[PDB]
Design a protein around this ligand. Structure first.
Ligand SMILES: Nc1nc2c(ncn2[C@@H]2O[C@H](COP(=O)(O)OP(=O)(O)CP(=O)(O)O)[C@@H](O)[C@H]2O)c(=O)[nH]1
Length: 260
């Protein structure tokens, strides 16, 4: 079998280190379709199956229609929405969970098969910090694996676990992110227009309320006007509201996960 894998994470997460450890010399560099940004792909074979890897440029969040130039965030937002992938590997710097897991939450809302890879666990153990990984799986609702991407042996072990999870299929558990009665009803008003898409209608409705360019652009003018009218029905700033809700959840998460 041939498996398609996307790797996504913040800059400095060790995403490139894991990618290189998995593919070695079997890598190519090109361009993303329609732009000049570098496209890095690689492959490896394991236990008779082929693994096809596409690396996404490092980003801190998905596209939210922010004038902040960020061609990379558009590319990663597009890929995370429309690029084929049997699994999205979200590489997270475990020494920096509260910030790194912000995009993790956005990815989880898409409901695409994904796993969270906590990288730099050696740095954590140097800080004498323990992460309750079962609690972390409970809060994220997706497989969570911990390693150091500079350790060849742990990377080799990661291949076996990744291969097993792809053969099993990835079991996702609903993520209890509630944005408050008012915004939830706005998501509810908008969800039917994103039914019958390749991604969660709830996710697309949220991203459209966040003004994700990749979502808004595909809409017809009347659908755009329904989205922009919903946006002004929000009594508060949508960007602040979703950030608050996401970071409030991540504060509860770290409490029950992180111990020194
Ligand atoms: N201690 C430790 N450092 C690691 C580990 N994985 C990567 N690093 C370090 O983190 C730094 C960033 O890694 P890199 O792979 O470059 O990060 P990225 O997230 O791919 C972003 P970019 O490659 O553009 O910097 C590197 O200096 C690398 O040595 C790990 O498991 N443990």
């Amino acid at each position: 079998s041939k498996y398609q894998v996307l790797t996504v994470g913040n800059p400095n997460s060790g995403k490139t280190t894991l990618f290189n450890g998995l593919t070695g010399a079997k890598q190519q560099v090109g361009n993303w379709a329609g732009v000049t940004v570098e496209k890095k792909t690689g492959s490896f074979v394991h236990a008779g199956d082929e693994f096809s890897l596409t690396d996404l440029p490092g980003i801190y969040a998905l596209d939210s229609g922010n004038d902040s130039n960020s061609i990379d965030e558009s590319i990663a937002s597009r890929a995370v929405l429309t690029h084929p992938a049997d699994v999205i590997i979200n590489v997270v710097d475990a020494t920096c969970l509260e910030r790194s897991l912000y995009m993790t939450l956005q990815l989880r809302e898409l409901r695409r098969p994904m796993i969270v890879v906590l990288n730099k666990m050696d740095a954590l153990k140097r800080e004498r910090v323990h992460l309750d990984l079962k609690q972390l799986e409970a809060f994220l609702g997706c497989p969570v694996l911990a390693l150091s991407a500079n350790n060849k042996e742990q990377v080799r072990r990661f291949k076996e676990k990744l291969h097993k999870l792809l053969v099993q299929g990835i079991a996702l558990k609903q993520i209890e992110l509630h944005y408050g009665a008012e915004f939830e009803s706005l998501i509810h008003e908008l969800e039917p227009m994103f039914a019958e898409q390749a991604v969660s209608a709830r996710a697309l409705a949220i991203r459209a309320l966040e003004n994700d360019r990749l979502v808004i652009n595909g809409l017809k003018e009347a659908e755009r006007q329904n989205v922009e009218q919903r946006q002004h029905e929000c009594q508060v700033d949508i960007d602040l509201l979703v950030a608050n809700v996401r970071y409030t959840y991540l504060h509860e998460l770290c409490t029950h996960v992180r111990r020194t």
